[PDB]
Amino acid sequence: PGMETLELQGAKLRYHQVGQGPVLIFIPGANGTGDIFLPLAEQLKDHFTVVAVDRRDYGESELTEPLPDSASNPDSDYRVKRDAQDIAELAKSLSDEPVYILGSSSGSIVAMHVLKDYPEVVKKIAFHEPPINTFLPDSTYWKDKNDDIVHQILTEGLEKGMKTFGETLNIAPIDAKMMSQPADTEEGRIEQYKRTMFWLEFEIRQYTHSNITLDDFTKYSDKITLLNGTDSRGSFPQDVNFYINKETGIPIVDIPGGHLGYIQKPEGFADVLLNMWG
Amino acid sequence: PGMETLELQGAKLRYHQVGQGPVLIFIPGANGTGDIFLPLAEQLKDHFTVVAVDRRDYGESELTEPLPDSASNPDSDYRVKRDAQDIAELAKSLSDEPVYILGSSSGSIVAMHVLKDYPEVVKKIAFHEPPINTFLPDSTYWKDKNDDIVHQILTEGLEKGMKTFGETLNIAPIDAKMMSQPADTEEGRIEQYKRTMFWLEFEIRQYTHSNITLDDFTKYSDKITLLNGTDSRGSFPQDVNFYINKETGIPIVDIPGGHLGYIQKPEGFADVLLNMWG
């Protein structure tokens, strides 16, 4: 709304444009959207054609293709180079002459890569408070500090909500210890976080309130066995089975282990499945 | 163990298979991957052809089409129905007879939908500790609690996120205040958290250690201005501009506001820009 569109490879790039005169392209930082520049643009519109971009991963811009799987790697250069190319292609569609460019924060980093890889579109460029470290002395120190902070923030946020969730459902301590144990590797721990966040957004609410009724069980009563772990007593999922059994007559079979008894006590769990179905 | 693949609409479904005899399909819960059943499958492989599935969004399975946008909706049934469909088409591809099926946790919910919508593929089925609340007398209490845990993770990321911006970028706290001001609708707040998580994983490490050298600046030193805010003195980004200035001679221009001075002091910011470029 109020925004123009430039279609590029993998994205529809949306930007605000106001004013008259030489093109001045503003590149946003962490918020990623050009609206943060509109009060500044109002002050400038008599001297520049001000262009404030939503970078392709943000705001009203939209990817038309998924990012490469490699983009989640901390060393990936795909996004920063693609953002820089976005600016250069937006510059050429708006002007035949080199333009004015200002980026702030990560936007200044994009602007450095515009200058490096497409200097032909740069008349003048400004780097407002850039947080890049690569050329600093001992830049590995700052790279490692950033990698650590990101790791800490992501992993710590989920463990709080995962404790609360466990206490709500009265999951046994044994079970909660094991379905929250952090993976033995670096990539194992990241995949855990991604897995848990997908589960939170896309599974737990959708599945636990899905359209199942007791009528759906009684039709096929003779086929159903309900399994409660002998080490997970008092937890919410056992109450769910207790209710099904109360209202349908379908029997509960007790089985070793807790909520994860199939991995906690494999031989014991198996023995019971053979009792049932062997 | 190499996994088997079944190509379905929208996904390559991957699964482990061991043993002989009637088919027995294990459906995983929140971890989403069948490998959690491999010790149990070893106990049963003399009696059943054991099949332990990676549900299509997890593990070695892979989507071949994006998830629908509406899958994010807490009331969406796309994923659980598609999960149940996957199991039934797996059963038909493995066996001309109805098969044995066991799901645990959210996998037992998938198993309920398999029995409900594809009863013809179920010989016998076990629901191990299901966390579904829909048919319970107090469903609403459990459902509202789940929505609330999910809501918790969102709002804790919001406030931890103000701590993130000031501690990842090392910037004055008034600037981190503005960078983390809550969006003014709930839908906007959900997008805000996604935008912070994306920036945290996909932007800050990749950009702040991208391949810019001081030689890249000296080559176009005449085009470049470094911008430091007058209200954000002391921060790491100003230290970066100080180092660039020290090594290349490129001038630093002070400009009103802090790290976000273009919106904090738009007319003071513009006046400086016009002295540089107007």
B31 by DSSP, 3-state: which? coil
For A2: left if phi > 0, alpha if psi spans -120 to 50, otherwise beta; the answer is left
* Contact between chains at B204 and A106 (C-beta distance less than 8 A): yes
Residue of B nearest to A162 (CA): B149
Q: Using the beta-carbon criterion (under 8 Å), do B136 and A223 form an inter-chain contact?
A: no
Q: How was this structure determined?
A: X-ray
A205:B44 CB<8 A: no
Among residues A174, A202, A239, which one has the least CA distance to residue B129?
A239
Q: How far apart are the first and last CA of chain B?
A: 67
Sign of the C-alpha dihedral, residues B77, A199, B143, B156?
negative
Chain B residues inside the 8 Å CB shell of A214: 135
User: C-alpha distances in angstroms, B22 versus A174, B97, B98, B111, B121?
Assistant: 33, 9, 9, 18, 13
Following DSSP, what letter does each residue of A47-61 receive, concatenated? T-EEEEE--TTSTT-
Q: Which of B77, B142, B263 sits opposite A206 (nearest CB)?
A: B77
Query: What φ, ψ does residue B95 adopt, rounded to 5°?
Result: -160, 130
Yes or no, beta carbons of B106 and A240 under 8 Å apart: no
Contact yes or no for B196/B157 (Cβ under 8 A): yes
Choose the closest CB to B198 out of A26, A57, A238: A57
Query: Mapped to the 3 state alphabet, what secondary structure does A83-97 carry?
Result: HHHHHHHHHHHHCCC
Report chain A residues whose CB lies below 8 A from the CB of B255. Answer: 128
* SS3 label, residue B158: helix
Q: Which of B240, B191, B164, B259 is nearest to A150 (CA)?
A: B164
In chain B, residues with a C-beta closer than 8 Å to the C-beta of A57 are: 198, 202
Nearest to A26 by CA among A10, A11, A12, A43: A43
Q: Do B266 and A43 touch (CB under 8 A)?
A: yes
Q: Is A10 left (phi over 0), alpha (psi -120 to 50) or beta?
A: left
Report how far residue B225's alpha carbon sits from residue B173's, in angstroms, rounded to the nearest whole number: 26
Do B217 and A118 touch, CB atoms closer than 8 A? Answer: no
Nearest CA in chain A to B265: A40
β-bridge mates for residue B31, sequence order:
none
Chain B hits for A109, CB-CB cut-off 8 Å, are 207-208, 210, 212
The residue in chain A having the minimum alpha-carbon distance to the alpha carbon of residue B181 is A31
Distance from CA of A126 to the nearest CA of B (A): 5
Q: Is B134 in Cβ contact with A207 (below 8 Å)?
A: no
Q: What domains does chain A contain, in order, with CATH numbers? A: 3-128 (3.40.50.1820), 139-206 (no CATH), 211-277 (no CATH)
Tell me, what DSSP letter sits at residue A68?
P
Judge: B273–A204 Cβ closer than 8 Å, yes or no: no
Q: Count Cβ–Cβ pairs < 8 Å, chain A vs chain B.
A: 390
Q: Given an 8 Å threshold on Cβ–Cβ distance, is A71 in contact with B202?
A: yes
Nearest-CA residue of chain A relative to B197?
Answer: A154
Chain A residue nearest residue B155, CA to CA: A157
Please give the residue of chain A at the shortest CA–CA distance from B27: A262
Structure tokens at B181: 């001001």
- Shortest Cα–Cα distance, A26 to chain B (Å): 10
Interchain pair A208, B153: CB under 8 A: no
Nearest by CB to B152, from A126, A161, A206: name it: A161
- A212: closest CA of chain B, how far (Å): 7
Contact B18, B4 (CB under 8 A): no
Give the helix/strand (H/E) hosting A3. strand A3-8
- Check if the beta carbon of residue B152 is closer than 8 Å to that of residue A251: no
- B90 vs B98: CA distance, rounded Å: 11
Q: Residue B12 forms beta bridges with which residues?
A: B7, B62
Which of A85, A196, A203 is most worth mutating to test chain B (most B CB atoms within 10 A of its CB)?
Answer: A203
Token pair belonging to A81? 């180079």
Interface contact flag, B227 A119, Cβ < 8 Å: no
Map tokens 């790791």 to a residue.
Answer: A151
d(CA B36, CA B42): 12
Cα A226 to Cα B115: distance, rounded to the nearest angstrom: 13
Nearest CA in chain B to A109: B207
Residue of B nearest to A84 (CA): B207
Alpha helices in chain A (DSSP H): 38-44, 78-94, 106-117, 139-169, 173-178, 186-202, 204-208, 215-218, 236-248, 261-264, 266-277
Residue B51 is inside which H or E element, if any?
strand B49-54
Q: CB–CB of A129 and B195 under 8 A?
A: no
Distance from CA of A112 to the nearest CA of B (A): 7
Cα–Cα distance for residue pair A200/B72, rounded to 1 Å: 10
Considering only the beta carbons, identify the residue of A134, A149, A259 that sits closest to B212: A134
